[model samples]
Target: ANQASVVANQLIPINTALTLVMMRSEVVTPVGIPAEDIPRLVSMQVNHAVPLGTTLMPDMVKGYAA
Candidate 1:
């Protein structure tokens, strides 16, 4: 699978992001989050409600304020 998404909506709430729950998306994308960028994705917590089917994207998540 070339796409990624939350494994389940029940596991991840509206505004937080987690690595353990990430799964291959049923659909793929041209600009979808790739595996290498997972590091950035893992470095974040979503500011909006990220639905299960939504393809993971780096910009979709926000990083901690260093």
Candidate 2:
């Protein structure tokens, strides 16, 4: 099965509300953020401001650290 990914139209700050979308496989760097984790990630607040279209790492999520 293909991997699922999360994306944002713009910058995501700590207090910013999510404007995210799920995308098909974007096989760039393997961030170890699996497909099933995408939805859970989108629902959580970001640990830092994720720049536009940057791959969301597991550590980027507030409660999910490396």
Candidate 3:
């Protein structure tokens, strides 16, 4: 349970950064940036947020909203 909290703490900032960088952008930003590139950018952003040994997992996002 405690480990999960630490993981959650890591995730919250990743989410916040994603919202800031991805959501708060020009409406036409996606037009220049390919749709597929968005996921890679997000993964890079999350990895940058967390520890060197940690990574962003698909289920992490799903679990958070649950």
What are the lDDT scores of the predictions, listed in order?
0.52, 0.58, 0.32
Which has the higher lDDT value, candidate number 1 or candidate number 2?
2
Please list the Cα RMSD from the true structure of every candidate, rounded to 1 decimal place. 4.7, 3.5, 14.1
Candidate 2 lDDT at 38 equals 59
Question: TM-scores, in order shown?
Answer: 0.52, 0.61, 0.22
TM-score attained by model 1: 0.52
Which is the leading candidate under lDDT? Answer: 2
Q: Candidate order by TM-score, highest to lowest?
A: 2, 1, 3
Cα lDDT of model 1 overall? 0.52
User: Is 2 or 3 the stronger prediction by TM-score?
Assistant: 2
lDDT of 2: 0.58
Candidate 2 wrong stretches, greater than 4 Å: 1-9, 17-19, 22-25
lDDT (C-alpha) at residue 57 in model 3: 43
- Candidate 1 ranges beyond 4 A from true positions: 1-11, 25-27, 64-66
For candidate 2, the C-alpha RMSD (Å) to the true structure equals: 3.5
Candidate 2: tens digits of C-alpha lDDT, residues 1-66? 356445443677775544345222355455446646655565577768877767777777777643
| Model 2: ten consecutive residues of lowest lDDT | 16-25
Q: Give one digit per residue, the lDDT tens place, for model 3 in 1-66.
A: 112211222334444344323322222311333223333444333423444223334443422221
